[PDB]
Amino acid sequence: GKVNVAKLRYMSRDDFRVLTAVEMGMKNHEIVPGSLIASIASLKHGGCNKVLRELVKHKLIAWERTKTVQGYRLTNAGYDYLALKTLSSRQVVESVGNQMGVGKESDIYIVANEEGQQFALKLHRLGRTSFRNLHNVSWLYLSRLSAMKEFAYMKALYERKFPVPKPIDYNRHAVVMELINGYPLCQIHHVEDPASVYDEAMELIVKLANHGLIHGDFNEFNLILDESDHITMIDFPQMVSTSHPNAEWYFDRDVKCIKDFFMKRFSYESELFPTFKDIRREDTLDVEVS
Amino acid sequence: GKVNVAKLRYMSRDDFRVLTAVEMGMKNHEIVPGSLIASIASLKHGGCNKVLRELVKHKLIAWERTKTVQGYRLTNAGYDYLALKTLSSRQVVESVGNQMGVGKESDIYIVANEEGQQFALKLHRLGRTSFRNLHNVSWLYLSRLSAMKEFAYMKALYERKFPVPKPIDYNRHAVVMELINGYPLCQIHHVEDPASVYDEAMELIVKLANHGLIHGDFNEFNLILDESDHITMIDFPQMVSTSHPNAEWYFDRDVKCIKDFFMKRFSYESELFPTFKDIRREDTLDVEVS
Ligand SMILES: O=C(Cc1ccc2ccccc2c1)Nc1ccccn1
Ligand SMILES: O=C(Cc1ccc2ccccc2c1)Nc1ccccn1
Ligand SMILES: [Cl-]
Ligand SMILES: [Cl-]
């Protein structure tokens, strides 16, 4: 057997309206008053409070009281559900499995469509830090923006024959993409030909730089090795322009990180590693993604 | 003499209201129609079109026509002016000098108050990349958010006796702080005692980690050495939680970057470098800044 996946909880037009109302409410309120939710949701029967209590019970929204405001906010599970239900209505996702990895700022899950074909889901989680020494609904917008940027870059890189997953669809903070069957490099113990995997990694750094991009977090946690020892890049959250005044330092750091890992894990060392002076710009993906 | 600084351009309350109206308009529009700007500004004498032409002439806004829409948007110079004029009305900034450094995502200028005391200004510049392979008012919000986070972290770190500049004030994408007199480590050729500067750098990585933070970009471009060979951190845009599943890799990368620089520039090497296992959490600045 393969990984277990659970069908998404059923969602009524009522639940979706109230849930959407809470989301809209959070543009202008850290805690959305129950009266504002009721008027935005405008249910035909106006048992809005019953529906909210039911959404609390299912952990999709949470109750909070400050000094002189009290009401509701979307939970991570609520935001997740809105994204996954939207993707479900486009026949992209039917079922969700357990978390089976992380990016720098994302959680990675296996999902399946109605036919039981498996895909990778990335849920972006930004705005985690709270600021109180001076608004903290930045997490909705920032997470949505990461997912959008990941989908756009993944599409642009895939079309330019880079070793990245085929992106399928996105909504809010959720990106669905080709599942890559293999192991992150960090949990590979032996390889028949380390030189070959090292070369793929170094050629990927060069090709990114030739397109105007430095990964910035290039490592054994972001690179998956498949059944035929080819690498796929699965996370690129904070890429730097080759035009940055300190671009060379970022480029060298990514190169040194790969060298350090290949020495530690495989006792492999080489002189076939790029310098920034080798880069010949061919594209402008740091300026515009098209 | 010291660095040249120029008094901020004079602007009438009318001109400043129209520029603020364009900014408000951009909450809901990539391109703000002239009619919407006029109704938001609501000038007593209604010469709004004259004022807009004058703001174009001074490069504070730009005119654009698409197929669907035609009107105005804030320029970088316009956003800069709004921030600096606001800081000017609080007596924080009277005069602006030339750019004299960069952070990873910010431009650094010398500014002066009315008495001619010099300070550092950081203008945050995010949302540089354009996405067209599928809204682009993200640059206002993201830049504002970087500045806010920098001010908050700088205050929290300063109060906890970290070697950072004393933060003074912020508005929009602008942060004003203590000017640190010295050289970025990257432009230091010799030091009497490299071991001592290396130790300060390594103790700073440990103290950050003890407070829940990994810098993530710790380098010779972010650290300024003053007249008495003490280091000050002047940029920390993308800090990582010590709770990150790959926290150890980020911590080690910051340590290796300092080691590599001290070997390259000063031929200095040491075994007095921290490991992640040494860290004993003392604070929660990765979760909440207070
Ligand atoms: O991470 C992986 C490797 C992997 C594959 C199956 C797994 C099954 C069960 C548990 C872990 C598993 C890990 N792929 C990946 C990552 C991002 C995007 C696309 N694909
Ligand atoms: O970067 C510097 C060093 C420095 C000082 C004076 C300069 C004058 C002319 C030219 C460069 C200059 C550089 N300080 C700093 C940075 C961020 C925040 C606060 N202070
Ligand atoms: Cl529905
Ligand atoms: Cl509806």
Numbering used by the authors:
A (entry chain A), B (entry chain B): 2 to 135, 146 to 301
Text from the published report:
The RIO kinases (RIOKs) are an evolutionarily conserved family of atypical kinases that are present in all eukaryotes, most archaea and some prokaryotes. The RIOKs have the protein kinase fold but lack the sequence motifs involved in substrate binding, including the activation loop. All three RIOKs are found in the pre-40S ribosome, although involved at different stages of the maturation process. The deficiency of RIOK1 or RIOK2 prevents the formation of mature 40S ribosomes, and in yeast both RIOK1 and RIOK2 are essential for cytoplasmic maturation steps starting from the 20S pre-rRNA.
A construct containing RIOK2 residues 1–329 gave crystals when combined with inhibitor 9, and from one of these crystals a complete X-ray dataset was obtained to 2.35 Å resolution. The final model contains 10 molecules of RIOK2 in the asymmetric unit. The overall structure of human RIOK2 closely resembles the structures of RIOK2 from the archaea Archaeoglobus fulgidus and the fungus Chaetomium thermophilum. It has an ordered winged helix-turn-helix (wHTH) domain on the N-terminus followed by a kinase domain. The co-crystallized compound 9 is bound in the ATP-binding site of RIOK2. The 2-aminopyridine moiety forms two hydrogen bonds with the hinge region of the kinase domain, to the backbone nitrogen and carbonyl oxygen of Ile191. The pyridine moiety is tightly enclosed by the hydrophobic side-chains of Met188, Ile109 and Ile245. The P-loop folds around the inhibitor such that Ile109 from strand β2 and Met101 from β1 can engage the top of the inhibitor. Eight of the ten RIOK2 molecules in the crystallographic asymmetric unit, eight molecules were seen as four RIOK2 dimers, each forming the same dimeric arrangement with a twofold rotational symmetry. This dimeric arrangement has a large interaction interface that involves the binding of compound 9 in an extended aromatic stacking interaction that includes His200 and Tyr194 for six stacked aromatic rings.
